[PDB]
Ligand binder design. Structure first.
Ligand SMILES: *[C@@H]1O[C@H](CO)[C@@H](O[C@@H]2O[C@H](CO)[C@@H](O[C@@H]3O[C@H](CO)[C@@H](O)[C@H](O)[C@@H]3O)[C@H](O)[C@H]2NC(C)=O)[C@H](O)[C@H]1NC(C)=O
Ligand SMILES: *[C@@H]1O[C@H](CO)[C@@H](O[C@@H]2O[C@H](CO)[C@@H](O[C@@H]3O[C@H](CO)[C@@H](O)[C@H](O)[C@@H]3O)[C@H](O)[C@H]2NC(C)=O)[C@H](O)[C@H]1NC(C)=O
Ligand SMILES: *[C@@H]1O[C@H](CO)[C@@H](O[C@@H]2O[C@H](CO)[C@@H](O[C@@H]3O[C@H](CO)[C@@H](O)[C@H](O)[C@@H]3O)[C@H](O)[C@H]2NC(C)=O)[C@H](O)[C@H]1NC(C)=O
Ligand SMILES: *[C@@H]1O[C@H](CO)[C@@H](O[C@@H]2O[C@H](CO)[C@@H](O)[C@H](O)[C@H]2NC(C)=O)[C@H](O)[C@H]1NC(C)=O
Ligand SMILES: *[C@@H]1O[C@H](CO)[C@@H](O[C@@H]2O[C@H](CO)[C@@H](O)[C@H](O)[C@H]2NC(C)=O)[C@H](O)[C@H]1NC(C)=O
Ligand SMILES: *[C@@H]1O[C@H](CO)[C@@H](O[C@@H]2O[C@H](CO)[C@@H](O)[C@H](O)[C@H]2NC(C)=O)[C@H](O)[C@H]1NC(C)=O
Ligand SMILES: *[C@@H]1O[C@H](CO)[C@@H](O)[C@H](O)[C@H]1NC(C)=O
Ligand SMILES: *[C@@H]1O[C@H](CO)[C@@H](O)[C@H](O)[C@H]1NC(C)=O
Ligand SMILES: *[C@@H]1O[C@H](CO)[C@@H](O)[C@H](O)[C@H]1NC(C)=O
Lengths: 91, 423, 100, 50, 50, 50, 44
């Protein structure tokens, strides 16, 4: 679940204070809460590996469902734009 | 019988500034209309799917804005890099290529473009939010850099298959052939062409810096979107004929039946304000989509190719183009060949030699008043009229305005200087 | 209704300038300075542009000029005799009048 | 192994008609809604920046 | 309705300007862009609103 | 699908069915309730056409 | 890629060897001289 436009601190406080209007709660461990520019993403593990964009989130960040070290989960990543190719330019 | 032919040329660089995307907004229909009011929300539920339709329309627009940006910029299969040594035949691209020393790898021109056009939801918040773009400015800069590296190191080959490296001066020589100017013109004048190019780029920086209206096209999009949200917020202040514009005062002072009537009047006013906002956003989005489609077409045809469409890729004969990113849009630098310093020459449709009519294969016959020469059309370069330069069809009695001149044949000319001894 | 900024006479003047440029200089004027060229040579280059050699035009210059002049006369007869020919522009006028 | 090739040609002139502009209208919002009426105008102001 | 029809007119005007540049100020290789047949040249004429 | 669905909305009216409004209420109150439904349905058609 | 021998029919000549940057030295073959030198090759 992506809470758009807000800080993860504000959301965490709202859950502990029971101040949010939605009555459901997403289980949090703190390892699956990632702050993006789009908002606070709870329920996905951010990884350093860049992949082709699958489910867009915003501000460069996409998410997908993949097996993590053999166990599958939703992960977030900064999308890859393409393979890098340095052209062998010379005179 | 008079033709004018350029004896010189100018390399000109012009800017074309196009919107690609617009601000992606999202509106909470209930919160906008019914600000923390249970009675208002319950009344709002009786009007139907209007809030759903408004949500879908704005979602569709936001998706379209990401599609427009991706289609304009994500036209390169791979992220290309320039070589470590930025030597391209004497052509200085330092003002279009990313500057590696900055926190954001943008060109000097891109820095200018981003500086001239201007999580706290500080602006116009009443249940109205703004979503970020899917691609960040850094990602757009990376696509632009990849396109520049591809064009500079491989010309148009990267846009129709694998990138094939070519020396830059040979790429330009082929672009010259593309506009009808032979390769020797560029090679003989390579320093002049490179100097005119570098001067034109410096002029681009001065033009964009000193003329604030150049980027008005992108600023207007921002300003129009700001006005729409500003207006939408202002619409909450209006009474629309109700006893009060404040929903809490209606519920506080009046009994339920009359309060519901006054609330229904406010609901009508706010809901119509949202429908007006969304309709205007759909019309503006269609305009932006058309602009984005034009920008993508000019990316494919001007940057990843060479275009023979007049004025499509700038004024003059098109040689090449370079993209630069800008907030909510793209700026194309179009490099064209402009004829200069023309001279008056006498011409003729054909040369009459032995009764046969000789026509140019690739050129125009000209005279300086005493001698006839064949020249290329876009650059004065007199050549001897020979049987290789011309072709023969018909005779001297059909072509109107044919002139009498000697067409030289090398083979019968050299036979004359080789076999004269007859032994 | 507000009047247009460019009057019908000014639009006619721009059209005239465009016709004079194309007729006396071909495409050289669109790309920069206008360079004079004899009209039959402009046509010779246009024929070469479509893959037909220059001698076809010069050998048949009188035929081509006559076909052109006849085609223009036919344009006048077509526009004169077919009131629906300009419907696209009339519809715009009708759409605005109807809306008001 | 059969190809057809023209032996003659025709020069053809055709017309293309395109709209360029439309009538530039201007509407006096107050006169249309509340023409020559102060009492009506004072209610029209309460509907926002219409 | 005026904004939607203005957008239609703008698209038409953009097409007319494109044709002016590619058909009148040049010679086009685009099939059927500048009439039927192989394009040689074009001439503009003024018309009301177009 | 949305436009037909809009026929079930009340838009502030007592009921979405014109026959129930006419059968339960006196003429002038029924006319008020009908105008409420007419405004809602007409707005729905204007939205559809736009 | 389809390599062919560089000849006076495949190339054109303009200017001398000093103005072009990066010019290389190679033989350009002229078919006509080789035959014509052959036409008077035995001088009989
Ligand atoms: C490509 O063109 C740019 C200019 O558009 C060149 O950048 C300029 O390089 C000079 C050094 O050569 C920089 O320093 C200058 O030094 C002189 C020394 O007298 C000083 O008087 C100047 O005030 C300046 O400090 C100059 O700042 C720099 N300009 C920019 C805008 O970067 C670049 O060197 C050219 N590259 C090639 C390969 O030709
Ligand atoms: C075609 O036009 C170009 C200009 O676009 C001509 O090149 C220009 O020639 C003038 C005079 O030869 C140069 O001016 C001189 O520059 C030196 C620089 O040190 C200065 O000391 C002199 O006092 C004078 O100002 C000008 O710089 C040069 N421009 C470039 C970009 O090279 C070219 O000669 C023309 N060719 C023909 C055949 O007409
Ligand atoms: C290619 O087609 C053109 C027509 O587009 C041919 O030219 C036409 O030839 C006919 C017969 O020679 C001409 O008709 C005659 O015209 C005279 C005019 O005085 C009249 O007295 C005769 O009774 C008859 O009607 C026709 O006018 C002429 N058209 C033009 C525009 O010149 C041309 O011969 C064709 N060429 C080939 C190789 O097929
Ligand atoms: C037209 O061009 C020819 C060729 O350049 C000119 O004749 C040459 O003039 C130079 C002097 O500038 C002489 O050294 C050459 O020997 C001349 N060649 C021939 C074949 O005559 C000719 O003078 C030019 N005419 C005009 C009016 O400029
Ligand atoms: C080009 O040369 C031809 C001859 O090769 C000229 O034709 C002659 O013109 C004279 C003019 O007095 C006539 O008396 C001859 O009978 C013509 N002979 C032939 C075979 O046609 C022709 O006039 C010349 N054209 C120009 C423009 O000088
Ligand atoms: C191509 O061959 C010419 C000779 O035919 C070379 O020119 C000579 O270069 C040497 C370099 O040291 C000079 O000392 C000679 O005086 C030059 N002679 C002439 C006639 O120019 C030329 O350098 C060669 N080019 C390449 C690229 O190898
Ligand atoms: C290309 O030529 C320039 C000339 O200044 C030289 O500095 C550069 O190293 C050359 N590059 C290669 C790959 O030879
Ligand atoms: C969230 O709040 C903390 C302070 O509580 C701040 O340091 C951080 O930058 C904020 N993050 C965003 C994305 O605004
Ligand atoms: C060509 O000659 C005409 C004669 O009137 C003159 O006006 C024109 O400027 C000349 N053009 C050039 C390039 O010399």
């Amino acid at each position: 679940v992506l809470y758009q436009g807000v800080n993860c601190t504000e959301v965490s406080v709202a859950i502990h204070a029971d101040q949010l209007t939605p009555t459901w709660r997403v289980y949090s461990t703190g390892s699956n809460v990632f702050q993006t520019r789009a908002g606070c993403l709870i329920g996905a593990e951010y990884v350093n590996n860049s992949y082709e964009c699958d489910i867009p989130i915003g501000a460069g960040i996409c998410a997908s469902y993949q097996t993590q070290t053999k166990s599958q989960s939703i992960i977030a990543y900064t999308m890859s734009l393409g393979a890098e190719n340095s052209v062998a330019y010379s005179n | 019988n008079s033709i004018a032919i350029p004896t010189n040329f100018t390399i000109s660089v012009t800017t074309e500034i196009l919107p690609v995307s617009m601000t992606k907004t999202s509106v909470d229909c209930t919160m906008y209309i019914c600000g923390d009011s249970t009675e208002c929300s319950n009344l709002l539920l009786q009007y139907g799917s209007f809030c759903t339709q408004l949500k879908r329309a704005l979602t569709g627009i936001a998706v379209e804005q990401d599609k427009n940006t991706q289609e304009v910029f994500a036209q390169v299969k791979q992220i290309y890099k320039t070589p470590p040594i930025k030597y391209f035949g004497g052509f200085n691209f330092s003002q279009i290529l990313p500057d590696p020393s900055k926190p954001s790898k943008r060109s000097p021109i891109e820095d200018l473009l981003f500086n001239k056009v201007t999580l706290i939801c500080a602006q116009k918040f009443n249940g109205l939010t703004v979503l970020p773009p899917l691609l960040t400015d850094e990602m757009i800069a990376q696509y632009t850099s990849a396109l520049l590296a591809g064009t500079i190191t491989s010309g148009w080959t990267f846009g129709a298959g694998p990138a094939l490296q070519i020396p830059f001066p040979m790429q330009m020589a082929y672009r010259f052939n593309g506009i009808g100017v032979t390769q020797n013109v560029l090679y003989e004048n390579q320093k002049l062409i490179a100097n005119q190019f570098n001067s034109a780029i410096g002029k681009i920086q001065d033009s964009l810096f000193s003329t604030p209206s150049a980027l008005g096209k992108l600023q207007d999009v921002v300003n129009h979107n700001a006005q729409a949200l500003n207006t939408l917020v202002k619409q909450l202040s209006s009474k629309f004929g109700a006893i009060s514009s404040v929903l809490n005062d209606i519920l506080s002072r009046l009994d339920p039946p009359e309060a519901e009537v006054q609330i229904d009047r406010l609901i009508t006013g706010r809901l119509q304000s949202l429908q007006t906002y969304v309709t205007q956003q759909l019309i503006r989005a269609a305009e932006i989509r058309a602009s984005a489609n034009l920008a993508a077409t000019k990316m494919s045809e001007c940057v990843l190719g060479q275009s023979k469409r007049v004025d499509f890729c700038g004024k003059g004969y098109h040689l090449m183009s370079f993209p630069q990113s800008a907030p909510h849009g793209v700026v194309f630098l179009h490099v064209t060949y402009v004829p200069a310093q023309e001279k008056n020459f006498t011409t003729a449709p054909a040369i009459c030699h032995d009764g046969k009519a000789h026509f140019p294969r690739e050129g125009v016959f000209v005279s300086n008043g005493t001698h006839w020469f064949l020249t290329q059309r876009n650059f004065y370069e007199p050549q001897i009229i020979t049987t290789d330069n011309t072709f023969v069809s018909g005779n001297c009695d059909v072509v109107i305005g044919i002139v009498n001149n000697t067409v030289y044949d090398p083979l019968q000319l050299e036979l004359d200087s080789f076999k004269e001894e007859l032994d």
